[PDB]
RNA sequence: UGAACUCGCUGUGAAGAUGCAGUGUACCCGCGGCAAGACGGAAAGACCCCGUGAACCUUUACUAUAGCUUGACACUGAACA
């Protein structure tokens, strides 16, 4: 499938680019996720007409919004006193839903799917390093303090 | 249930005769019995054979097929070795 882009995806295409990609990748991933649209002759003519002078600006303001969201909190200890057992060995395993609710209780607007983790379970108490995926380009590393 | 004025023997005869030949006996007709014969009645022999007949059934008969299994392509992607 010949497809014209709207986002800096990693390995296939640059911005404003019409690349030929596998049709499953074009159908299930790009056109739902809002990064690419099918290279109809009308579509590439319409993109050269108006949308190339807007989607770059939208990418710049999205990168700025990711910078704003990542630096409204970087203090790197969010306190959760969830339930635990004695001397390590957390009671019930922590969901990233709960980690999302903790940081949106004190700070950022980051939801569940905007959060990555090495483990994802955080099944003991201590300084567990948490990553973040508010965008595929930029990360953020704000750390958690879980206690009983 | 072809029609009957439907005896016995010996012989002849699709080769085991109430019906032919030869011969012996028997007046016409019931009734109650028996059941040897009328190749008695019943049922186009059920065993056998024939049909370039049928059915089911078996299998290492033939040719197929549902199924189960194999691989290619599609639905079907991204990375990294
Ligand atoms: Mg005789
Ligand atoms: Mg008699
Ligand atoms: Mg009697
Ligand atoms: Mg008879
Ligand atoms: Mg017959």
From Swiss-Prot:
UniProt keyword Zinc present: no
One GO cellular component term: cytoplasm
Pfam families: Ribosomal_L9_C, Ribosomal_L9_N
Annotated positions of the N6-succinyllysine modification: 71, 83, 112
Record-linked Gene3D superfamilies: Ribosomal protein L9, C-terminal domain, Ribosomal protein L9, N-terminal domain
Domain of life of the native organism: Bacteria
Function noted in UniProt: One of the primary rRNA binding proteins, it binds very close to the 3' end of the 23S rRNA.
Family named by the database record: Belongs to the bacterial ribosomal protein bL9 family.
UniProt subunit comment: Part of the 50S ribosomal subunit. In stalled/collided disomes (pairs of ribosomes where the leading ribosome is stalled and a second ribosome has collided with it) bL9 in the collided ribosome contacts bS6 and uL2, while it contacts only helices of the 16S rRNA in the stalled ribosome; the inter-ribosome bridge thus formed is different from that formed between normally translating ribosomes.
Protein name, UniProt field: Large ribosomal subunit protein bL9
Protein's gene: rplI
């Amino acid at each position: 499938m010949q497809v014209i882009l709207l986002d800096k995806v990693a390995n296939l295409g640059s911005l404003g680019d019409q690349v030929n990609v596998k049709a499953g990748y074009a159908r299930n991933f790009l056109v739902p996720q809002g990064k690419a649209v099918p290279a109809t002759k009308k579509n590439i003519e319409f993109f050269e007409a108006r949308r190339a002078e807007l989607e770059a600006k939208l990418a710049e303001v999205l990168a700025a919004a990711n910078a704003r969201a990542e630096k409204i909190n970087a203090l790197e200890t969010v306190t959760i006193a969830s339930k635990a057992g004695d001397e390590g060995k957390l009671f019930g395993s922590i969901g990233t839903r709960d980690i999302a609710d903790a940081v949106t209780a004190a700070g950022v607007e980051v939801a569940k799917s905007e959060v990555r983790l090495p483990n994802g379970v955080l099944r003991t108490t201590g300084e567990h390093e948490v990553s973040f995926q508010v965008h595929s380009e930029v990360f953020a590393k704000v750390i958690v303090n879980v206690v009983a």
